[PDB]
RNA sequence: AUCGGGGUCUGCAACUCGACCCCGUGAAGUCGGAGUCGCUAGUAAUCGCAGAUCAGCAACGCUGCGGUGAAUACGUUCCCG
RNA sequence: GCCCGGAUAGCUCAGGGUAGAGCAGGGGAUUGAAAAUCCCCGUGUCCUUGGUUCGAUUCCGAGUCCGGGCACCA
RNA sequence: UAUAUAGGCGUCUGGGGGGAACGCGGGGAAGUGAAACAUCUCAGUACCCGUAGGAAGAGAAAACAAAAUGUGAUUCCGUGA
RNA sequence: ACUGUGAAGCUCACACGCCAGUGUGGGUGGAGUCGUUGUUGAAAUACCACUCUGAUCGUAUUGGGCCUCUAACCUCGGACCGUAUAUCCGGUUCAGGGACAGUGCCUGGUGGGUAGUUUAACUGGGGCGGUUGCCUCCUAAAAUGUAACGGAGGCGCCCAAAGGUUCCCUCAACCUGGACGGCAAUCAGGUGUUGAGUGUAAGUGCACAAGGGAGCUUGACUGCGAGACGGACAUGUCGAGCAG
């Protein structure tokens with residue numbers, strides 16, 4: 368189906384520059400930094416509920432936004448993708464960080 | 470430098486309160502000592518910066 | 519093979535040092551590198567028997583016997599005498 | 600202070616699932632006798648520590664010894 | 674050399690040089706002090722160049738000020754120091 | 755998730771390739787793989803989203819490297835004119851070089867060619883040699899202090915316990931008896947009052963222990979500090995006690 372996969376701009380190879388996401392919001396998930404410095408989460412699709420998935424996604428972002436590495440250099444949230452099973456595109460706007468559900 | 474100068478900061482308010490020296494080969498890990506912190510007003514754990 | 523135990527024979531005498539018998543133990547070894555030896559027919563390959571030396575044997579050595587018995591030789595191009 | 604390069608067998612030097620080769624040393628070959636050819640050996644903390652991965656000589660971090668170039672007005 | 678210009682003729686009107694001090698615009702040292710010396714000072718002094726006037730330069734806010742409805746071109750004196 | 759907006763099934767081409775064999779499109783027909791799948795470091799390649807490694811394309815931005823051209827600019831190359839005299843100068847024209855060179859501002863190099871200066875003191879004359887700060891002893895003449903290129907040394911550290919506190923103990927040496935074991939290792943008895951030891955030089959001390967052992971801990975604190983030592987000054991040293 369569809370989910371959330373953010374590209375946090377950090378150096379995964381450095382041990383200090385690591386991320387471990389863990390959020391819980393129904394409207395207890397886990398996340399980690401992959402080899403290519405990618406984060407994985409669970410989200411909905413375009414053909415789904417509007418205020419349900421959006422509200423649940425904010426808590427995951429806040430834990431990640433509070434887990435930004437100290438030594439990270441450059442833009443943090445380079446891109447966000449919530450594409451469906453076959454639906455291409457569906458890229459969210461990385462600028463939005465406050466009042467996501469509106 | 471065998472015996473470098475180290476600074477101890479409170480674990481609650483994070484104020485640099487003391488400065489001392491330790492051997493970095495005998496004691497390789499960050500020093501942990503209970504010291505009187507004037508800002509808190511009591512004895513709090515202190516750790517090497 | 520090695521080792522433990524019990525025995526037989528010669529020898530005055532089997533510890534260093536004989537052979538053989540029985541019981542048990544059961545190592546390496548899966549055909550062997552560069553290299554290298556023997557043989558042209560009853561020969562090579564293989565199988566057993568006897569003699570000398572000798573009290574006993576370390577004989578799997580030496581000298582003879584007989585049994586079953588093969589493949590190959592185009593030719594001096596090359597090594598040795 | 601900043602940026603690169605080097606550390607691997609007795610010696611020299613190549614290299615995400617292999618630690619290798621020549622000079623060395625040793626035993627045996629070929630020779631009337633040697634060298635070179637041959638065969639087979641033993642040689643090793645991959646500078647020292649930790650990190651990722653099922654796994655690192657190889658990727659990341661710190662440190663030691665070195666070498667080159669540019670900085671340095673208590 | 675064509676448009677024409679450089680140039681060539683004729684005629685009027687100006688300039689050149691001097692002076693003791695004072696002025697305006699430029700160029701601009703070292704001896705000395707720092708108990709040494711290079712930043713710094715000496716000093717924009719000594720000296721040099723260009724120009725004046727009886728004086729020269731400046732002068733009429735793209736100014737000060739600080740919530741007071743404050744001053745109101747320039748120049749030169751005394752304080753601020 | 756796909757299937758007559760036509761699978762398997764065959765057959766046509768290409769790509770890599772260790773041909774291990776996979777991927778892409780093409781032609782006929784007509785219903786596929788697939789889930790626990792069995793070894794697994796890890797699972798299915800059912801598919802999907804992000805993405806690494808290299809190689810391919812495209813748009814938009816963006817920097818360099820070249821070859822021409824004449825028109826800026828350059829020519830002490832030729833010929834005319836100002837000019838009767840002119841190897842000066844200027845102008846016209848032809849022939850070459852050409853956006854290079856030269857120059858202006860900015861910037862990095864080599865730079866005794868030139869300039870301004872530094873290159874210590876003590877010292878049985880100066881040089882060579884040696885020394886320059888702190889700590890301990892003797893000279894030092896029984897308070898403190900006291901010179902010489904007088905006589906001897908040490909320092910520019912170390913310890914997270916080798917600091918704080920509570921409790922306990924007595925060493926070195928010698929004698930005797932013991933498997934290796936010896937002068938000298940571990941064990942037992944006795945004599946033994948300081949001859950041992952105190953991180954590190956020397957001196958003053960310490961057996962009442964400041965020497966040896968063990969448990970808990972961080973006062974190797976914060977705001978202060980009556981009264982003093984020592985001193986040209988600047989420095990330096992001791993301190994009962996109050997509060998947290």
Ligand SMILES: [Zn+2]
Pocket residue numbers: 479480481482483484506507508509513
């Ligand atoms: Zn505190």
